[PDB]
Amino acid sequence: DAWEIPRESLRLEVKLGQGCFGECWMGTWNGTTRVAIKTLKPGTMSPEAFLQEAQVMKKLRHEKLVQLYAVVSEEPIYIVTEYMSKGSLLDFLKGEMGKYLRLPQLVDMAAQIASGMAYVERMNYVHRDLRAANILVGENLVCKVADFGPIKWTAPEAALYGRFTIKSDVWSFGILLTELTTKGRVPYPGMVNREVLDQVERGYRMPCPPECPESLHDLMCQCWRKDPEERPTFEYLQAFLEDYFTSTEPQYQPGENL
Numbered sequence: 001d002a003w004e005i006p007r008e009s010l011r012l013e014v015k016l017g018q019g020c021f022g023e024c025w026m027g028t029w030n031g032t033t034r035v036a037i038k039t040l041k042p043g044t045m046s047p048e049a050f051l052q053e054a055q056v057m058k059k060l061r062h063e064k065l066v067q068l069y070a071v072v073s074e075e076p077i078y079i080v081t082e083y084m085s086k087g088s089l090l091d092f093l094k095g096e097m098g099k100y101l102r103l104p105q106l107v108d109m110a111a112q113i114a115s116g117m118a119y120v121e122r123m124n125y126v127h128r129d130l131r132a133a134n135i136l137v138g139e140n141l142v143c144k145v146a147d148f149g150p151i152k153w154t155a156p157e158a159a160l161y162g163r164f165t166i167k168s169d170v171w172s173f174g175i176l177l178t179e180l181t182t183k184g185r186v187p188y189p190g191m192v193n194r195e196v197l198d199q200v201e202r203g204y205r206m207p208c209p210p211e212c213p214e215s216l217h218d219l220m221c222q223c224w225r226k227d228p229e230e231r232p233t234f235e236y237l238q239a240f241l242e243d244y245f246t247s248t249e250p251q252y253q254p255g256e257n258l
């Protein structure tokens with residue numbers, strides 16, 4: 001494999017997140033270039049299964065996807081991507097860093113995520129796990145799509161019958177629109193996973209947030225139609241939020257929170 005790397009090239013400087021899947025670290029590869037690294041706990045999971053993740057990352061390059069730099073096929077395993085300076089989007093929004101992110105900033109992010117997903121769309125691949133916990137931010141509020149390793153953020157047909165399409169990713173993206181607009185709170189407040197599947201299949205969807213323009217709530221409701229083929233594309237979503245403040249909501253003025 002030409003992606004492969006000799007083990008002596010990686011300083012694993014600082015630790016970041018642990019778990020039953022392994023762990024990930026901030027570090028320095030090749031002396032020069034700073035990088036993120038994901039390990040594997042040899043006891044908990046298998047090599048050929050955990051390495052099918054990298055397989056996918058190999059065949060995907062796009063400026064709004066996290067870039068796999070390198071791999072290490074022997075335990076302890078190391079999948080090695082670029083490093084993103086500002087951590088998870090979830091952490092960013094709840095964080096003091098995003099006490100002051102007004103709609104303008106938030107909608108641009110959604111546009112960059114969208115573009116990247118519109119790429120995934122173009123490549124006939126499927127994420128199965130789109131939510132602010134798997135979006136990374138870097139300098140200038142660049143956002144990128146990741147995948148580390150359930151039901152509020154995924155569409156019914158997927159949760160139930162396992163029909164995980166790109167249209168399951170559109171739904172969740174709609175739910176991600178609620179994270180960006182709430183400063184990274186959880187969806188379905190005072191609701192728990194089994195009460196969610198009822199209300200949703202019964203037809204319950206979330207209301208337009210405080211001070212979030214209804215244009216965005218309608219977009220979410222396009223994201224969350226039950227008939228999947230009549231949810232919109234990431235091609236359309238991208239162009240939509242790209243033009244949001246010129247074409248859809250140019251009246252817009254800020255306020256307390258958005």
Ligand SMILES: *C(c1c(C#Cc2cc(NC(=O)c3cccc(C(F)(F)F)c3)ccc2C)c2cncnc2n1CCOC)[C@@H](C#N)C(=O)NC
Binds near residue numbers: 060066091
């Ligand atoms: C730790 C972490 C990282 C990182 C990383 C990382 C991610 C991935 N996964 C992908 O990006 C991916 C896999 C499959 C498919 C796709 C698709 F299709 F969407 F493109 C993407 C593989 C390997 C690695 C190393 C990271 C990077 N920069 C800054 N901080 C980072 N952190 C810390 C997280 O914030 C606290 C992350 C992982 N992995 C983790 O374990 N979180 C708990």
